[PDB]
Amino acid sequence: MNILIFGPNGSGKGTQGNLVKDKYSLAHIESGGIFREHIGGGTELGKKAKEFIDRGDLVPDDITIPMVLETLESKGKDGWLLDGFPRNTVQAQKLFEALQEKGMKINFVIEILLPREVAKNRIMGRRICKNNPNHPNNIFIEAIKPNGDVCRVCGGALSARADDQDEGAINKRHDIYYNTVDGTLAAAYYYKNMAAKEGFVYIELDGEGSIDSIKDTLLAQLA
Numbered sequence: 001m002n003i004l005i006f007g008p009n010g011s012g013k014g015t016q017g018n019l020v021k022d023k024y025s026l027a028h029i030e031s032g033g034i035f036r037e038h039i040g041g042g043t044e045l046g047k048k049a050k051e052f053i054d055r056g057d058l059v060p061d062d063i064t065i066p067m068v069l070e071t072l073e074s075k076g077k078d079g080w081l082l083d084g085f086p087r088n089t090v091q092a093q094k095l096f097e098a099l100q101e102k103g104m105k106i107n108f109v110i111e112i113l114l115p116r117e118v119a120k121n122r123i124m125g126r127r128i129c130k131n132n133p134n135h136p137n138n139i140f141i142e143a144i145k146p147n148g149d150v151c152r153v154c155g156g157a158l159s160a161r162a163d164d165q166d167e168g169a170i171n172k173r174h175d176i177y178y179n180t181v182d183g184t185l186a187a188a189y190y191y192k193n194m195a196a197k198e199g200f201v202y203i204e205l206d207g208e209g210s211i212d213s214i215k216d217t218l219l220a221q222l223a
């Protein structure tokens with residue numbers, strides 16, 4: 001099973017990604033990890049890429065795409081979940097042409113849908129418990145609202161994380177994600193629009209439901 005996943009920050013994408021890569025035994029391949037294996041490990045492509053990075057430029061797509069394809073072929077040989085690439089329509093199209101050339105096939109594309117302002121609030125509304133940071137508390141997700149000012153699990157103190165409160169940072173990432181001209185949504189639609197012509201199934205997940213709720217709907221559809 002080769003699966004591409006798309007979703008904004010605030011959509012719970014990583015959580016769902018992990019449930020999918022576990023049931024199904026996939027290699028989870030994300031954009032960051034690809035660069036490490038290659039730049040870090042100095043494959044022929046990684047050495048060429050690092051020249052760009054070290055002067056503050058982006059790696060050209062003509063180097064990025066084959067870097068991705070190498071990692072899918074090595075790390076992802078027994079099945080992969082590709083997460084966080086492509087981000088735009090040019091990448092998306094070049095990735096798909098490159099997969100077709102290697103005769104590598106997509107089986108599923110998953111998009112987690114959530115309106116922008118909802119995603120941003122779910123990020124900002126996170127509260128971390130002083131006693132156990134795994135305890136879920138969010139001022140904007142009803143089912144896990146804090147108990148007054150304290151953790152709804154253990155009563156410990158709650159704080160906000162500065163990165164969650166940085167609206168500029170959040171907005172710049174959403175601006176790319178929710179860009180329907182040529183951003184990540186446009187890249188997801190590129191897959192959506194050809195799915196049944198190319199023998200894969202596109203799956204839209206409702207990002208507003210609980211973790212367990214999304215996971216059930218997703219599992220149901222992966223067979």
Ligand SMILES: [Co+2]
Nearest residue numbers: 129135151154
């Ligand atoms: Co707690």
